Design an enzyme around this catalytic site. Structure first.
Site, PDB file in Angstrom:
ATOM      1  N   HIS A 243      77.096  -4.492  49.967  1.00 55.73           N
ATOM      2  CA  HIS A 243      76.280  -5.256  49.046  1.00 55.73           C
ATOM      3  C   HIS A 243      76.714  -6.714  49.146  1.00 55.73           C
ATOM      4  O   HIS A 243      77.696  -7.032  49.813  1.00 55.73           O
ATOM      5  CB  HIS A 243      76.418  -4.665  47.640  1.00 55.73           C
ATOM      6  CG  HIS A 243      77.828  -4.592  47.139  1.00 55.73           C
ATOM      7  ND1 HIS A 243      78.196  -5.036  45.887  1.00 55.73           N
ATOM      8  CD2 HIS A 243      78.968  -4.174  47.736  1.00 55.73           C
ATOM      9  CE1 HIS A 243      79.494  -4.860  45.719  1.00 55.73           C
ATOM     10  NE2 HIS A 243      79.989  -4.342  46.829  1.00 55.73           N
TER      11      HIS A 243
ATOM     12  N   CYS B 244      71.787 -10.039  46.250  1.00 50.48           N
ATOM     13  CA  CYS B 244      71.281  -8.684  46.440  1.00 50.48           C
ATOM     14  C   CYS B 244      70.075  -8.679  47.351  1.00 50.48           C
ATOM     15  O   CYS B 244      70.046  -7.998  48.379  1.00 50.48           O
ATOM     16  CB  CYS B 244      70.869  -8.065  45.115  1.00 50.48           C
ATOM     17  SG  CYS B 244      71.999  -8.335  43.873  1.00 50.48           S
TER      18      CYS B 244
ATOM     19  N   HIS C 223      71.042  -5.257  40.712  1.00 49.48           N
ATOM     20  CA  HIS C 223      71.928  -5.409  41.850  1.00 49.48           C
ATOM     21  C   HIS C 223      71.638  -4.281  42.836  1.00 49.48           C
ATOM     22  O   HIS C 223      71.269  -3.178  42.429  1.00 49.48           O
ATOM     23  CB  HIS C 223      73.397  -5.396  41.422  1.00 49.48           C
ATOM     24  CG  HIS C 223      74.336  -5.784  42.521  1.00 49.48           C
ATOM     25  ND1 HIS C 223      74.633  -7.097  42.816  1.00 49.48           N
ATOM     26  CD2 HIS C 223      74.997  -5.034  43.434  1.00 49.48           C
ATOM     27  CE1 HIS C 223      75.464  -7.136  43.840  1.00 49.48           C
ATOM     28  NE2 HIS C 223      75.699  -5.898  44.234  1.00 49.48           N
TER      29      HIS C 223
END
Lengths: 153, 118
Positions: free
Chosen positions: B92, B31, B80
């Site tokens: 992501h 992340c 996250h």
């Protein structure tokens, strides 16, 4: 001589150790103290491990149960551990629990002598296409252990 | 404060790179690092956790492209994150790799915590 049900127990075991190792603390040890402080080395921001994992020796003692000795060398290298002011340090990072290992399936890929490797198909909480994770088990001492640090996650 | 055209395109090119804790490299991200890697291409910024980027970023209510979106996965709070790429999508970096995922997925949407912007 390692079954599928047993392997998932070990793989889920490495999962636990890997996360806690990377977080700097074994959550069971509630008497621990986590040194405040960040620093930069190798273009990485580093943070201090909690007391329970404060020294490399404490780290090595944590993992020699589930990971072969070689997995621990490479891991300390691969994940760029370092020692400052006598306390071990990790580059800051986050984890991802996207893979549902608890509801995984294991298929045996190899068994040759002292080494066994299984292929895991892991469902994603995401609904994402499920993931192929091959885990190799090697017997150190007489205990079956995983031969790579980051095998699970 | 940043070329969103560059951010979203610079991120998108990296699709398929795998996952590693504390990964600030093209050989594996998380992340925090994926955003760090993409951000340092344009301006110099420091490396922090998903929790740090939540607390060091300016508050907004509704993401525009280039904004950062936050989710609660493995723990309470931000655990996250990704970048809003438009539509209802976000890029992501996750266990299976860098991915494009939409905010109307059943995992993300209940756990969409909020959005914060650089």
């Amino acid at each position: 001589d390692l079954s599928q049900k047993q392997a998932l127990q070990l793989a889920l075991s490495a999962r636990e150790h890997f996360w806690n190792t990377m977080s700097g603390h074994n959550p069971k040890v509630k008497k621990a103290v986590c040194p405040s402080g960040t620093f930069e080395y190798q273009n990485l921001q580093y943070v201090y491990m909690c007391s329970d994992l404060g020294t490399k020796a404490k780290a090595v003692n944590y993992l020699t149960p589930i990971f072969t000795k070689t997995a621990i060398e490479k891991g300390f290298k691969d994940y760029h551990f370092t020692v400052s002011k006598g306390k071990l340090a990790v580059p800051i990072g986050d984890g991802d629990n996207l893979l549902n290992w608890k509801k995984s399936t294991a298929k045996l890929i190899s068994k040759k002598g002292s080494t066994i490797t299984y292929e895991f198909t892991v469902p994603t909480l995401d609904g994402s296409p499920s993931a192929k994770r091959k885990v190799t088990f090697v017997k150190e001492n007489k205990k079956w252990k995983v031969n790579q640090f980051d095998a699970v996650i | 404060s940043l070329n969103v055209s560059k951010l979203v395109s610079d991120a998108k090119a990296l699709v398929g790179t795998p996952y590693k804790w504390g990964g600030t490299t093209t050989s594996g991200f998380d992340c925090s690092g994926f955003i760090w890697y993409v951000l340092n291409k344009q301006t110099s910024v420091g490396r922090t956790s998903t929790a740090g980027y939540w607390s060091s970023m300016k508050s907004i209510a509704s993401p525009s492209v280039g904004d950062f979106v936050f989710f609660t996965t493995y723990k309470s709070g931000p655990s996250h994150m990704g970048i809003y790429i438009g539509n209802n999508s976000f890029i992501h970096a996750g266990s299976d790799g860098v991915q494009i995922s939409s905010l109307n997925n059943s995992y993300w949407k209940p756990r969409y915590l909020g959005a914060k912007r650089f």
